[PDB]
Design an enzyme around this catalytic site. Structure first.
Site, PDB file in Angstrom:
ATOM      1  N   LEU A  72      27.631  -1.913 -49.973  1.00 52.10           N
ATOM      2  CA  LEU A  72      26.676  -2.625 -50.818  1.00 52.10           C
ATOM      3  C   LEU A  72      25.415  -1.821 -51.101  1.00 52.10           C
ATOM      4  N   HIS A 112      39.126 -10.626 -52.527  1.00 50.87           N
ATOM      5  CA  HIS A 112      37.913 -11.380 -52.813  1.00 50.87           C
ATOM      6  C   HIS A 112      37.979 -11.996 -54.212  1.00 50.87           C
ATOM      7  N   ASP A 137      23.866 -10.607 -54.309  1.00 51.62           N
ATOM      8  CA  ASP A 137      22.842 -10.819 -53.276  1.00 51.62           C
ATOM      9  C   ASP A 137      22.831  -9.723 -52.225  1.00 51.62           C
ATOM     10  N   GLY A 138      24.013  -9.221 -51.867  1.00 47.78           N
ATOM     11  CA  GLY A 138      24.115  -8.167 -50.852  1.00 47.78           C
ATOM     12  C   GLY A 138      23.403  -6.899 -51.280  1.00 47.78           C
ATOM     13  N   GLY A 161      31.941  -0.692 -52.647  1.00 47.87           N
ATOM     14  CA  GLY A 161      32.327  -1.271 -51.359  1.00 47.87           C
ATOM     15  C   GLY A 161      31.158  -1.298 -50.386  1.00 47.87           C
ATOM     16  N   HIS A 214      34.472 -16.529 -51.189  1.00 49.60           N
ATOM     17  CA  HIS A 214      33.997 -15.142 -51.216  1.00 49.60           C
ATOM     18  C   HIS A 214      35.080 -14.098 -50.946  1.00 49.60           C
ATOM     19  N   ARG A 245      12.918  26.162 -40.339  1.00 53.56           N
ATOM     20  CA  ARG A 245      11.488  26.239 -40.659  1.00 53.56           C
ATOM     21  C   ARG A 245      10.967  27.653 -40.397  1.00 53.56           C
ATOM     22  N   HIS A 260      11.645  14.186 -35.114  1.00 57.30           N
ATOM     23  CA  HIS A 260      11.901  15.085 -36.249  1.00 57.30           C
ATOM     24  C   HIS A 260      12.940  16.175 -35.949  1.00 57.30           C
ATOM     25  N   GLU A 278      15.223   8.750 -49.083  1.00 61.38           N
ATOM     26  CA  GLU A 278      16.351   9.664 -48.832  1.00 61.38           C
ATOM     27  C   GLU A 278      17.706   9.094 -49.245  1.00 61.38           C
ATOM     28  N   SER A 304       7.634  21.665 -48.543  1.00 62.53           N
ATOM     29  CA  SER A 304       8.170  21.884 -47.192  1.00 62.53           C
ATOM     30  C   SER A 304       9.635  22.309 -47.235  1.00 62.53           C
ATOM     31  N   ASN A 351      24.274 -16.376 -57.304  1.00 63.59           N
ATOM     32  CA  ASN A 351      25.172 -17.484 -56.975  1.00 63.59           C
ATOM     33  C   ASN A 351      24.822 -18.252 -55.695  1.00 63.59           C
TER      34      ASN A 351
HETATM   35  C1  LIG Z   1      26.404  -2.065 -46.732  1.00 61.60           C
HETATM   36  C2  LIG Z   1      27.375  -3.185 -46.500  1.00 61.60           C
HETATM   37  N1  LIG Z   1      27.124  -4.091 -45.527  1.00 61.60           N
HETATM   38  C3  LIG Z   1      27.979  -5.096 -45.283  1.00 61.60           C
HETATM   39  C4  LIG Z   1      29.126  -5.227 -46.052  1.00 61.60           C
HETATM   40  C5  LIG Z   1      30.065  -6.371 -45.715  1.00 61.60           C
HETATM   41  N2  LIG Z   1      30.216  -7.395 -46.755  1.00 61.60           N
HETATM   42  C6  LIG Z   1      31.323  -7.382 -47.540  1.00 61.60           C
HETATM   43  C7  LIG Z   1      32.785  -7.059 -47.312  1.00 61.60           C
HETATM   44  O1  LIG Z   1      32.858  -5.896 -46.488  1.00 61.60           O
HETATM   45  C8  LIG Z   1      33.488  -6.721 -48.632  1.00 61.60           C
HETATM   46  O2  LIG Z   1      32.962  -5.528 -49.232  1.00 61.60           O
HETATM   47  C9  LIG Z   1      33.459  -8.221 -46.554  1.00 61.60           C
HETATM   48  O3  LIG Z   1      33.727  -9.338 -47.424  1.00 61.60           O
HETATM   49  C10 LIG Z   1      34.755  -7.859 -45.817  1.00 61.60           C
HETATM   50  O4  LIG Z   1      35.843  -7.687 -46.741  1.00 61.60           O
HETATM   51  C11 LIG Z   1      35.127  -8.951 -44.816  1.00 61.60           C
HETATM   52  O5  LIG Z   1      36.180  -8.490 -43.968  1.00 61.60           O
HETATM   53  P1  LIG Z   1      37.059  -9.525 -43.105  1.00 61.60           P
HETATM   54  O6  LIG Z   1      36.072 -10.457 -42.445  1.00 61.60           O
HETATM   55  O7  LIG Z   1      37.964 -10.195 -44.121  1.00 61.60           O
HETATM   56  O8  LIG Z   1      37.822  -8.641 -42.142  1.00 61.60           O
HETATM   57  S1  LIG Z   1      30.909  -8.489 -48.903  1.00 61.60           S
HETATM   58  C12 LIG Z   1      29.340  -8.974 -48.123  1.00 61.60           C
HETATM   59  C13 LIG Z   1      28.586 -10.178 -48.617  1.00 61.60           C
HETATM   60  C14 LIG Z   1      28.203  -9.910 -50.046  1.00 61.60           C
HETATM   61  O9  LIG Z   1      27.526 -11.041 -50.563  1.00 61.60           O
HETATM   62  P2  LIG Z   1      27.220 -10.945 -52.116  1.00 61.60           P
HETATM   63  O10 LIG Z   1      26.216 -12.016 -52.429  1.00 61.60           O
HETATM   64  O11 LIG Z   1      26.835  -9.524 -52.442  1.00 61.60           O
HETATM   65  O12 LIG Z   1      28.640 -11.217 -52.809  1.00 61.60           O
HETATM   66  P3  LIG Z   1      29.381 -12.576 -53.281  1.00 61.60           P
HETATM   67  O13 LIG Z   1      28.402 -13.560 -53.854  1.00 61.60           O
HETATM   68  O14 LIG Z   1      29.989 -13.080 -51.993  1.00 61.60           O
HETATM   69  O15 LIG Z   1      30.352 -12.036 -54.289  1.00 61.60           O
HETATM   70  C15 LIG Z   1      29.189  -8.240 -46.963  1.00 61.60           C
HETATM   71  C16 LIG Z   1      28.046  -8.564 -46.027  1.00 61.60           C
HETATM   72  C17 LIG Z   1      29.367  -4.275 -47.052  1.00 61.60           C
HETATM   73  N3  LIG Z   1      30.462  -4.326 -47.842  1.00 61.60           N
HETATM   74  N4  LIG Z   1      28.477  -3.273 -47.274  1.00 61.60           N
HETATM   75  C1  LIG Z   2      11.844   8.818 -43.074  1.00 62.96           C
HETATM   76  C2  LIG Z   2      10.921   9.984 -43.277  1.00 62.96           C
HETATM   77  N1  LIG Z   2      11.062  10.762 -44.372  1.00 62.96           N
HETATM   78  C3  LIG Z   2      10.268  11.822 -44.592  1.00 62.96           C
HETATM   79  C4  LIG Z   2       9.278  12.134 -43.667  1.00 62.96           C
HETATM   80  C5  LIG Z   2       8.422  13.360 -43.943  1.00 62.96           C
HETATM   81  N2  LIG Z   2       7.001  13.096 -44.160  1.00 62.96           N
HETATM   82  C6  LIG Z   2       6.109  13.306 -43.164  1.00 62.96           C
HETATM   83  C7  LIG Z   2       5.989  14.306 -42.035  1.00 62.96           C
HETATM   84  O1  LIG Z   2       7.288  14.481 -41.463  1.00 62.96           O
HETATM   85  C8  LIG Z   2       5.069  13.770 -40.931  1.00 62.96           C
HETATM   86  O2  LIG Z   2       5.665  12.673 -40.212  1.00 62.96           O
HETATM   87  C9  LIG Z   2       5.510  15.652 -42.626  1.00 62.96           C
HETATM   88  O3  LIG Z   2       4.105  15.614 -42.943  1.00 62.96           O
HETATM   89  C10 LIG Z   2       5.802  16.891 -41.767  1.00 62.96           C
HETATM   90  O4  LIG Z   2       4.944  16.950 -40.623  1.00 62.96           O
HETATM   91  C11 LIG Z   2       5.595  18.174 -42.563  1.00 62.96           C
HETATM   92  O5  LIG Z   2       6.174  19.275 -41.853  1.00 62.96           O
HETATM   93  P1  LIG Z   2       5.755  20.794 -42.185  1.00 62.96           P
HETATM   94  O6  LIG Z   2       5.893  20.955 -43.678  1.00 62.96           O
HETATM   95  O7  LIG Z   2       4.315  20.917 -41.718  1.00 62.96           O
HETATM   96  O8  LIG Z   2       6.734  21.614 -41.378  1.00 62.96           O
HETATM   97  S1  LIG Z   2       4.628  12.447 -43.709  1.00 62.96           S
HETATM   98  C12 LIG Z   2       5.370  12.078 -45.301  1.00 62.96           C
HETATM   99  C13 LIG Z   2       4.540  11.627 -46.469  1.00 62.96           C
HETATM  100  C14 LIG Z   2       3.821  10.377 -46.033  1.00 62.96           C
HETATM  101  O9  LIG Z   2       2.973   9.963 -47.096  1.00 62.96           O
HETATM  102  P2  LIG Z   2       2.084   8.689 -46.749  1.00 62.96           P
HETATM  103  O10 LIG Z   2       1.500   8.217 -48.041  1.00 62.96           O
HETATM  104  O11 LIG Z   2       2.917   7.722 -45.943  1.00 62.96           O
HETATM  105  O12 LIG Z   2       0.961   9.281 -45.761  1.00 62.96           O
HETATM  106  P3  LIG Z   2      -0.512   9.897 -46.031  1.00 62.96           P
HETATM  107  O13 LIG Z   2      -1.231   9.148 -47.115  1.00 62.96           O
HETATM  108  O14 LIG Z   2      -0.222  11.314 -46.490  1.00 62.96           O
HETATM  109  O15 LIG Z   2      -1.131   9.717 -44.681  1.00 62.96           O
HETATM  110  C15 LIG Z   2       6.664  12.556 -45.344  1.00 62.96           C
HETATM  111  C16 LIG Z   2       7.425  12.569 -46.648  1.00 62.96           C
HETATM  112  C17 LIG Z   2       9.154  11.316 -42.530  1.00 62.96           C
HETATM  113  N3  LIG Z   2       8.235  11.534 -41.558  1.00 62.96           N
HETATM  114  N4  LIG Z   2       9.975  10.248 -42.362  1.00 62.96           N
HETATM  115 CA   LIG Z   3      26.206 -13.925 -53.541  1.00 67.92          CA
END
Ligand SMILES: Cc1ncc(C[n+]2c([C@](O)(CO)[C@@H](O)[C@H](O)COP(=O)(O)O)sc(CCOP(=O)(O)OP(=O)(O)O)c2C)c(N)n1
Ligand SMILES: Cc1ncc(C[n+]2c([C@](O)(CO)[C@@H](O)[C@H](O)COP(=O)(O)O)sc(CCOP(=O)(O)OP(=O)(O)O)c2C)c(N)n1
Ligand SMILES: [Ca+2]
Ligand SMILES: [Ca+2]
Lengths: 667, 662
Positions: A115, A25, A154-155, A113, A260, A519, A472, A410, A384, A184
């Site tokens: 992004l 690149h 940008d990525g 690598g 790129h 739990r 869950h 997370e 919890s 860019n």
């Molecule tokens: C989380 C995640 N998702 C997608 C990519 C894929 N991706 C990336 C790569 O994987 C390089 O790291 C790919 O350029 C692969 O090398 C391509 O493989 P072939 O097609 O040659 O087989 S870079 C990228 C776009 C990033 O855009 P940016 O704006 O971040 O970067 P710049 O302005 O182009 O410098 C995107 C979308 C990644 N690296 N990480």
């Molecule tokens: C991607 C993701 N991460 C964490 C949670 C955990 N989480 C959630 C739950 O799982 C409910 O869906 C838990 O309340 C479990 O029921 C607890 O289990 P026990 O301790 O009773 O065993 S809700 C949540 C906080 C959400 O805060 P909000 O501000 O979105 O909601 P509100 O103002 O409190 O209505 C968080 C942090 C989730 N549901 N999804």
């Molecule tokens: Ca870019």
């Protein structure tokens, strides 16, 4: 030489190295070369002769595909990265892999690598510096004082993880974090306006960042003024919006998606040399240009000054200095092993039927006074996951604290913790419900790839969590961790195995450790001294018979109690049975052949696995002539005790399946 | 009754159902009840008698822990959700699970619980409505016209996926998307200022949303005015900043984290009844309150009016109307099976050594004219994943198009596509490098859980991708997909298996299909008519011997050629060898036992698996007395040919491991 000429050295090495590899690149290195020249030559505090200097600034290339940018910088400034390695870009076992890797290469701080994860790592490094400074600095002795600089594109901006970590960085007022946005206008699909239209400056202002707009990324004076402004703002992280042209220098490919991710081609490279006025042949750098780029003399001087500062600190604060050195090295306290073993033995002697999430909290409470390096947290689940101990102090309340409220983030949390472990000085632990490891999945993989010590506390491990239901209730998540290279995964069956797993995790220097915790309350098992010591071997004989067993149960976590009950029933009926507790498959697999044979003898084929997780995993240990009492479906919303009944986790069913297996073997 | 009394019915049902279950989340339902009363009673276009009405508004509870809010609404407005079901909240096999589930419950549009994904699904539903309207509406005939409403809290706002999908929603100018932010200052750890300090309104203005600040979420007049304003803004999605008090009504627990996620307790419920002036016993709702909440009469009137509009459209545009009905039902064209089989047969008769990513593009090209329901895209990897065909039209350029530039947003892309599939009318496909399935992992799981049809095009499947190195080279990702309940996973070995896998994916009616595709060219295998037909069975005998085999190779994807080469060497020595191609373990497992026995006979234990992925998976088919030629480590940055050699994917090594078994 002019600043542009010095920056052009990066452009030449980058396009030429990509061309020789016929892969890579050139766009981003060519677009960011002027920014890199200013940052590295005018600001970066580093010593090429000691990449491990404790108080060095940290640099992170979040747009890691531009790997030749960092290789050029490390080579030019005098790190142990010879030109021959640049000639071996993207070749097997070179110090110049296609995306930068920590450990592979002197001066590379993290592996990028994927992004978005680089900026997250940088946020972690900045949190580490702030926290370490607050813990260790004393009046007249500021032994921790360094910046964290990140490049991102940008990525990284589009990825959700950037929102998580940059939001939190604003809350924590990380004034020594300075990020440069390679603005860019181009991504892989083309001109970004079709899919990316954020007012990015306004977004970062919403996070509480200091944003500097409309920087000419090809003008050294403009870049320098911007960096000075960012350094003057001590109470906010800074974003520098650097307008650049991808592939700068190429008459025909600059400003296009073509630049790129593929070699420019020999014809275009020749034209680029002409546009840039760069006369030198591929991999040729004159002595005059090395003289201006080299950082050995300045680096030596800066580290020597710091060493003198540290010596004065050690005189005035000897115990603190010894702790700083120990923690920066990642060494454990000399008495930790003995004290942790004492705790484990106490638990075995004093049974308690408690949830392994609680047993985890108890281990944190026991280890906390011994491990001041802990920097722990939960993704909005402290009450919890049970991640707080009596000595926890949140860093948003006191900067010298040891606990982070990560919020509902997370992925960001886990990649931040990767930055914390990479920084040195701390032992991070992170936590969420096991299901939501799926939100953080690639950051978990990255900890394993980078050989980083991090304890991952994953509670609410099965249908045992009950009423919250199938969104869950983990089924297939533990198996996913178990098959991850260099991951350690522990599913303790009681408070004793929980403490052993925690000890294993904090003492594991070369990779992460996931704790799979319940739990609901777990029965303590009886153990001899030998069995107690054998927990750390990952799999061990918990119950046995005289002579060769007819039947071996293999169980983990909350299901060991069930397997033991089935063993007792069958034993009373004259069946020769054995129970193996398998808290860690990865640790068991690492034991030698003789030990594994002693636990799972090859002669015994009637093997029954018992685990409230995906069944398909267990063929590894039960083969084609055994049985598996596992899950094959998603869960259901109901009280846990009714779910265990529904899904066959009952003594009657385990006994029936075992007898059914034996009947098949006999006929 | 007063609007506050009507909203209080939700508060009572919610706190009481949570109390009876001794489990659940009363805080958000109590905090959002006044907002819900205005939205549902004054604006929402829906028919409780037909939750599948094509042109209904879609409602999404992104803060899904507040499940009693939606159950209260569905019950009160007259959906098929009786009081007995509310009394069985969180109980085995009830219609009221702890987080709402699509399919379980009349009127539930999506399954939430994983924070952030609801708003993503809503963005998908709004994209679907906008695109379907542009495709089907005609002058004087606007048969598609509905809103997408979402509720979301601090957790959804903190999650990265909200950034991905709300950024894209701004770019796409989704004027019929209206989101309500439950701005209550509380999360599980306590007061959010310790970990969440965004100027959320400023953030959303940066996305190009219309934002309405400082709404009193407990004042019907304030809420109603804000919804009217949001509906008047047709060129931007809208965010309503609703200031609420979590657990509103509880003297001691309102505004506290205590009210988030546990029963209030009997004493506190009694005090709450007193504060709210709610005089009815648990699960008692008076007739006057039902009369004002019930939506059956208005709902049937609105749907009947729409049916009449659709009938007039069908008279003027019969072919288009038939296509609308077919696509909304998720039915395939009647001649698709025959046409796809013809394409597959042509490929077998005309061999080509191409990458399976290219074979994938070729299948999209073949199917494109046949499946106008395609709404496909890639996460900024169109020229690498090969997701464009000659008829692709990007929806940012042409609203009636069939292609989405998702940007670098894997998780958001996948959960948006879940919303697209849930909406009806489309068959979404999404794409990125296989490694980055890890960024989208829970949305992939949610597609399986919700039984949704989505084709997931995952290219660059192994160390075969070469120089990009171990951060990009999948090893353990395919194994994780294979053990996901209700997931179908295909790793085709050539252009023919690729087309069969694509056909299987589009013909699934009840779950998603992941295609595991190579960067590098794959040789085409020769097949009999029987073998060609058996590709769809997921595992089949590709090369055989006379009589019972002494040795069976089991191979997938790019490694089938290597296994065949090992087979040829051992066959020449006089070994009774077999090669099984296993493009899909899930399709194989579902076959009858006689078929499975014909391919992997139980008596033949000398089995060698060959795949450039994690070895541990393969014990399922090789047991304890076989061998596995797989990966046990991360990859390395080097050319593909050298990596295959380094990691043991050589004829010599495969032959040597086979000879060890014999
Ligand atoms: C989380 C995640 N998702 C997608 C990519 C894929 N991706 C990336 C790569 O994987 C390089 O790291 C790919 O350029 C692969 O090398 C391509 O493989 P072939 O097609 O040659 O087989 S870079 C990228 C776009 C990033 O855009 P940016 O704006 O971040 O970067 P710049 O302005 O182009 O410098 C995107 C979308 C990644 N690296 N990480
Ligand atoms: C991607 C993701 N991460 C964490 C949670 C955990 N989480 C959630 C739950 O799982 C409910 O869906 C838990 O309340 C479990 O029921 C607890 O289990 P026990 O301790 O009773 O065993 S809700 C949540 C906080 C959400 O805060 P909000 O501000 O979105 O909601 P509100 O103002 O409190 O209505 C968080 C942090 C989730 N549901 N999804
Ligand atoms: Ca870019
Ligand atoms: Ca909240």
């Amino acid at each position: 030489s002019s600043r542009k000429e010095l920056a052009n050295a990066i452009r030449a090495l980058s396009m030429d190295a990509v061309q020789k590899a016929k892969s890579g690149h050139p766009g981003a290195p060519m677009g960011m070369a002027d920014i890199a020249e200013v940052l590295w030559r005018d600001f970066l505090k580093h010593n090429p002769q000691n990449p491990s200097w404790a108080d060095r600034d940290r640099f992170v290339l979040s747009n890691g595909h531009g790997s030749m940018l960092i290789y050029s910088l490390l080579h030019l400034t005098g790190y142990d990265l010879p030109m021959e390695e640049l000639k071996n870009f993207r070749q097997l076992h070179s110090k110049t892999p296609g995306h930068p890797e920590v450990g592979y290469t002197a001066g590379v701080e993290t592996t990028t690598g994927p992004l978005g994860q680089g900026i997250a790592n940088a946020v972690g490094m900045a949190i580490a510096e702030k926290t370490l400074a607050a813990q260790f600095n004393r009046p007249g002795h500021d032994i921790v004082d360094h910046y964290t600089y990140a490049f991102m594109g940008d990525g990284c901006m589009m990825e959700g993880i950037s929102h998580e970590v940059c939001s939190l960085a604003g809350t924590l007022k990380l004034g020594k974090l300075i990020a440069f946005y390679d603005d860019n206008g181009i991504s892989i699909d083309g001109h970004v306006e079709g899919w990316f239209t954020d007012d990015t400056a306004m977004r970062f202002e919403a996070y509480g960042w200091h944003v500097i707009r409309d920087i000419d990324g090809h003008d050294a004076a403009s870049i320098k003024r911007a960096v000075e402004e960012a350094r003057a703002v001590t109470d906010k992280p800074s974003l520098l919006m650097c307008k650049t042209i991808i592939g700068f220098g190429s008459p025909n490919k600059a400003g296009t998606h073509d630049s790129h991710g593929a070699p420019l081609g020999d014809a275009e490279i020749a034209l680029t040399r002409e546009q840039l006025g760069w006369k030198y042949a591929p991999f040729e750098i004159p002595s005059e240009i090395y003289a201006q780029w080299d950082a050995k003399e300045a680096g030596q001087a800066k580290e020597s000054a710091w060493n003198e500062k540290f010596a004065a600190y050690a005189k005035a604060y000897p115990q603190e200095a010894a702790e700083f050195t120990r923690r920066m090295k990642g060494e454990m306290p000399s008495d930790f092993d003995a004290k942790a073993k004492e705790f484990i033995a106490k638990l075995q002697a004093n049974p308690a039927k408690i949830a392994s999430r609680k047993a985890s909290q108890n281990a944190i409470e026991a280890f906390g006074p011994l491990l001041p390096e802990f920097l722990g947290g939960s993704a909005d689940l402290a009450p919890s996951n049970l991640t707080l101990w009596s000595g926890s102090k949140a860093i948003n309340e006191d900067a010298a604290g040891n606990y982070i409220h990560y919020g509902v983030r997370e992925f960001g949390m886990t990649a931040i913790a990767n930055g914390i472990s990479l920084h040195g000085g701390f032992l991070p632990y992170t936590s969420t419900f096991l299901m939501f490891v799926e939100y953080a999945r690639n950051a978990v993989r990255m900890a394993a790839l980078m050989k980083q010590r991090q304890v991952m506390v994953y509670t609410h491990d099965s249908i045992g969590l009950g009423e919250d239901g199938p969104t869950h209730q983990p089924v297939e998540q533990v198996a996913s961790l178990r098959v991850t290279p260099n991951m350690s995964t522990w599913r303790p069956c009681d408070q004793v195995e929980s403490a052993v797993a925690w000890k294993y995790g904090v003492e594991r220097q070369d990779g992460p450790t996931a704790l799979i915790l319940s739990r609901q309350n777990l029965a303590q098992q009886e153990r001899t001294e030998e069995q107690l010591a054998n927990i750390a071997r990952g799999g061990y004989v918990l119950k046995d018979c005289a002579g060769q067993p007819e039947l071996i149960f293999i169980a983990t976590g909350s299901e060991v109690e069930l397997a033991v009950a089935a063993y007792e029933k069958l034993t009373a009926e004259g069946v020769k049975a054995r129970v193996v507790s398998m808290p860690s498959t990865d640790a068991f697999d690492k034991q030698d052949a003789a030990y594994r044979e002693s636990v799972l003898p090859k002669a015994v084929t009637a093997r029954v696995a018992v685990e409230a997780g995906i069944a398909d995993y267990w063929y590894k240990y039960v083969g084609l002539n055994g049985a598996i009492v596992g899950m094959t479906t998603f869960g259901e919303s109901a009280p846990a005790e009714l779910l265990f009944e529904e899904f066959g986790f009952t003594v009657d069913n385990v006994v029936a399946k075992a007898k059914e297996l034996l009947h098949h073997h006999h006929h």
